Design a protein around this ligand. Structure first.
Ligand SMILES: *[C@@H]1O[C@H](CO)[C@@H](O)[C@H](O)[C@H]1NC(C)=O
Ligand SMILES: *[C@@H]1O[C@H](CO)[C@@H](O)[C@H](O)[C@H]1NC(C)=O
Ligand SMILES: *[C@@H]1O[C@H](CO)[C@@H](O)[C@H](O)[C@H]1NC(C)=O
Ligand SMILES: *[C@@H]1O[C@H](CO)[C@@H](O)[C@H](O)[C@H]1NC(C)=O
Ligand SMILES: *[C@@H]1O[C@H](CO)[C@@H](O)[C@H](O)[C@H]1NC(C)=O
Ligand SMILES: *[C@@H]1O[C@H](CO)[C@@H](O)[C@H](O)[C@H]1NC(C)=O
Ligand SMILES: [Cl-]
Lengths: 596, 201
């Protein structure tokens, strides 16, 4: 028997044992998030430890088959994913140090509290205390206090931990034959051995920067318009040519400009489409929402939800004694078990979230036939992009009127279209420079291009230049403002939100063309279009079995990420923004600061 | 004399498909209607015979093979099928003359923590002959080195468990299968239904 034949038998034994152990861990994790008890914490840890130990043993056994002697690429993909060392390539001492640094930074972030001055007892956590301030408060000093105190009392604790975190992560990545920890993260988009579909890790940097150059004109006019509206609200705080103060952006970091909508709404006398009152007028419950979502996917040729879905999912808050983690999630426990955990309320937001989460379920049911190690999105941005395009069609007035939630007499004029597109750009467009600049800073830190004594200096030079955002308080090298975000202090790659954003509009533009949609791209509804559903399913069933460049080609016809569909979506707003900024300064000066 | 079909279909526990059980039926009147009349048989596909005109002919012997598999493997209990069950556990010949009966037993053969009572053969040197049974527990040698009787590198235990849980999907839920073989050798008839062998009176 050849090495490739022994690996096929090894992967055959692995698939059957992994599916059982993964189901035990997923079921024990479900029983905790739906019934938060102390007994369920231990059963979740016991089942999770047995699953983690099984993978560590199989990873060592998988590393006994040399990949060079395997020619079947589907077998090589499963062996390569299982042979991934990760932290197991470091010494036992350094891996124990690394896991301690990771737990401490996660503990500092989740438990870090800030106490108001003159009351050492009135303290606020990030969630919900400081987040409520950064999302609703209009007081300059109150927002400045929450922004600065979170970074000077919690971020400074993370600064020494993050320095040793970079050293050990670089030693881990370089022992796995990567350039640095940033190059390690970029391996999620790597493709080798497929002629015409290969993709290098360094190519992601060039593609992200190239597509970002085309986003700059739209973002600069969005930035200029937001600055003008905010300058009328804070005339003594904002320069007409300077960057935007970092604490006046809608959240703790300015990751999304969504909350700036009340002050930057173009036509503040035309109300939003809120079918929440209509859902209560028609006695809608949570089952009706998910039933309507089920009808949506069925209308495009996708299968209905399994019987076990309606029986095992938790589509409502358990209430009273039984507590649960109300964050909406989609569960793929395996072996035909698909569930959705959600404390659904009769609102329009939960209506759109149900379509977003059931889109993850359709993705899971599609590639369930794949081997165990190939049951995932094409890359890190695929799964979340599939969920986003579902809420895009479900929120259009064309769809809301076809289901009886929006009145037919309700007419849509170009003033409500601009209000909708502006609200969308504050979240979608407003996060792209934030995401790219943050991830580029970490790429350069891991690559060694930013010295330790210039971490915070380079961080805010890039905020001013790339994001057009200035810090309200000068920060020396005792701070660690990037670590004040969850993903940085909890060791999660961030570029996935940039690629996913460009993916979802590539998906939507392609599916809407298959649905024969006429008019602006943002008004599209792919409902009742089996042709669009067939084109999407041709990628969903692939899972990780094929390169992401090929999976993307099955939907959009192109092999690479493209920013043109994103610009096609926001073109009605981009032309309106340019007309609004005809007597305003577009761009920003990086030398101005609110503390100058 | 009524044929003991109740012992086969209403058994408390079924056999693992690798060690499938066979109950020979002989010298009795077979009330085939009693079958179709009692459980909701999800699958009832007969090959070479007619289920509508069942208890009208006679047979030398009737064999009832019973075991348990998952839902997606019921399709393998048919002539000319491939897969782990058809190749390593229970194989039906190409000229099969009989009926295959299967029904969902999630209420009986599943438990919350996992019912690891039912097994199946995952590896074997060759495919099974029709109606062949292999209950050996020899460690499968996948490589070129001897296994010495214990599991290791390229040395796997040949039998795997289902671990039936009631929250599984229908394709992974347990299904009880009963295979009725109808034999007709050079011997007088011994098993007839309501056929014209009332003449025995
Ligand atoms: C949740 O846990 C409590 C604590 O034992 C138990 O009484 C209750 O039955 C559990 N509920 C469910 C749905 O498992
Ligand atoms: C690779 O192996 C799988 C089984 O693991 C098989 O189904 C597939 O046909 C093989 N592909 C090639 C190109 O040999
Ligand atoms: C895993 O780590 C070992 C050393 O600990 C190294 O020799 C091997 O090449 C690594 N393999 C992979 C796939 O990372
Ligand atoms: C899905 O719909 C079909 C009819 O198109 C129905 O036969 C089937 O039972 C449904 N599935 C579930 C799980 O209800
Ligand atoms: C889709 O078709 C259904 C009937 O099958 C209809 O009620 C609904 O209005 C249609 N929606 C769209 C957007 O075409
Ligand atoms: C909307 O369209 C009307 C003409 O139909 C035009 O006069 C008006 O300026 C437009 N407004 C915007 C914001 O596009
Ligand atoms: Cl910051």
């Amino acid at each position: 028997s050849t090495i490739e034949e022994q690996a096929k038998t090894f992967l055959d034994k692995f698939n059957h044992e992994a599916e059982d152990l993964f189901y035990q861990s997923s079921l024990a994790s479900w029983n905790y998030n739906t019934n938060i008890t102390e007994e369920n914490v231990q059963n979740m840890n016991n089942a999770g430890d047995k699953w983690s130990a099984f993978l560590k043993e199989q990873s060592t056994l998988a590393q006994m088959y040399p990949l060079q002697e395997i020619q079947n690429l589907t077998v090589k993909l499963q062996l390569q994913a299982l042979q991934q060392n990760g932290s197991s390539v470091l010494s036992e001492d350094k891996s124990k140090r690394l896991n301690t640094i990771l737990n401490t930074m996660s503990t500092i972030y989740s438990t870090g509290k800030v106490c108001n001055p003159d009351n050492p007892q009135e303290c606020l956590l990030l969630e919900p205390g400081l987040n409520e301030i950064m999302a609703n408060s209009l007081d300059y000093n109150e927002r400045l206090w929450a922004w600065e105190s979170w970074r000077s009392e919690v971020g400074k604790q993370l600064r020494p931990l993050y320095e040793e975190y970079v050293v050990l992560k670089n030693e881990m990545a370089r022992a796995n034959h990567y350039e640095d920890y940033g190059d390690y993260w970029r391996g999620d988009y790597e493709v080798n051995g497929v002629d015409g579909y290969d993709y290098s890790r360094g190519q992601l940097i060039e593609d992200v920067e190239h597509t970002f150059e085309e986003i700059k004109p739209l973002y600069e006019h969005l930035h200029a318009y937001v600055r003008a509206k905010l300058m009328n609200a804070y005339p003594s705080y904002i320069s007409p040519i300077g960057c935007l103060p970092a604490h006046l952006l809608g959240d703790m970091w300015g990751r999304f400009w969504t909350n700036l909508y009340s002050l930057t709404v173009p036509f503040g006398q035309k109300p939003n489409i809120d079918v929440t009152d209509a859902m209560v007028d028609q006695a809608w419950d949570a089952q009706r929402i998910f039933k309507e979502a089920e009808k949506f996917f069925v209308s495009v040729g996708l299968p209905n939800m399994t019987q076990g879905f309606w029986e095992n999912s938790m589509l409502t808050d358990p209430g009273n004694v039984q507590k649960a983690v109300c964050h909406p999630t989609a569960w793929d426990l395996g072996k035909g078990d698909f569930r959705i955990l959600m404390c659904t309320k009769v609102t329009m937001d939960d209506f759109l979230t149900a379509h977003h989460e059931m889109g993850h379920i359709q993705y899971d049911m599609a590639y369930a036939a794949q081997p165990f190690l190939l049951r995932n999105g094409a890359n890190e941005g695929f799964h979340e992009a599939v969920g986003e395009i579902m809420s895009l069609s479900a929120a259009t007035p064309k769809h809301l009127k076809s289901i009886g939630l929006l009145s037919p007499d309700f007419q849509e004029d170009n003033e409500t279209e601009i209000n909708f597109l502006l609200k969308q750009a504050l979240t979608i467009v407003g996060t792209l420079p934030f995401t790219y600049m943050l991830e580029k800073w970490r790429w350069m830190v891991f690559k060694g291009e930013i010295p330790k004594d210039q971490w915070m200096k380079k961080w805010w030079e890039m905020k001013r230049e790339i994001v057009g955002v200035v810090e309200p308080v000068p920060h020396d090298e005792t701070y660690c403002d990037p670590a004040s975000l969850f993903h940085v202090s909890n060791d999660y790659s961030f570029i996935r939100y940039y690629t996913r954003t460009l993916y979802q509009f590539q998906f939507q533009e392609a599916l809407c063309q298959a649905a024969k949609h006429e008019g602006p791209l943002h008004k599209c509804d792919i409902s009742n279009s089996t042709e669009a559903g067939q084109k999407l399913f041709n990628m969903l069933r692939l899972g990780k079995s094929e390169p992401w460049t090929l999976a993307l080609e099955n939907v959009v016809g192109a092999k690479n990420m493209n920013v043109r569909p994103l610009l096609n979506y926001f073109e009605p707003l981009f032309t309106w923004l340019k007309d609004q900024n005809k007597n305003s300064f577009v761009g920003w000066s990086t030398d101005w600061s609110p503390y100058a | 004399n009524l044929c003991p079909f109740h012992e086969v279909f209403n058994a408390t526990r079924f056999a693992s498909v690798y060690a499938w059980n066979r109950k020979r039926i002989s010298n009795c009147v077979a009330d085939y209607s009693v079958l179709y009349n009692f459980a909701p048989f999800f699958a009832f596909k007969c090959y070479g015979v007619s289920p509508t005109k069942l208890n009208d002919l006679c047979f030398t012997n009737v064999y009832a093979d019973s075991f348990v598999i998952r839902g997606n493997e019921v399709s393998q209990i048919a002539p000319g099928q491939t897969g782990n069950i058809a190749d390593y556990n229970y194989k039906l010949p190409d000229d099969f003359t009989g009926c295959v009966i299967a029904w969902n037993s999630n209420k009986l053969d599943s438990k919350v923590s996992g019912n690891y009572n039912y097994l199946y053969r995952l590896f074997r040197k060759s495919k099974l002959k029709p109606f062949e049974r292999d209950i050996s527990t020899e460690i499968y040698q996948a490589g070129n080195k001897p296994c010495n009787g214990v599991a290791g590198f390229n040395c796997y235990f040949p039998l795997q468990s289902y671990g039936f849980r009631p929250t599984y999907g229908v394709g992974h839920q347990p299904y009880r299968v009963v295979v009725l073989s109808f034999e007709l050798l050079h011997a007088p008839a011994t098993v007839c239904g309501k056929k014209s062998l009332l003449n025995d009176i």
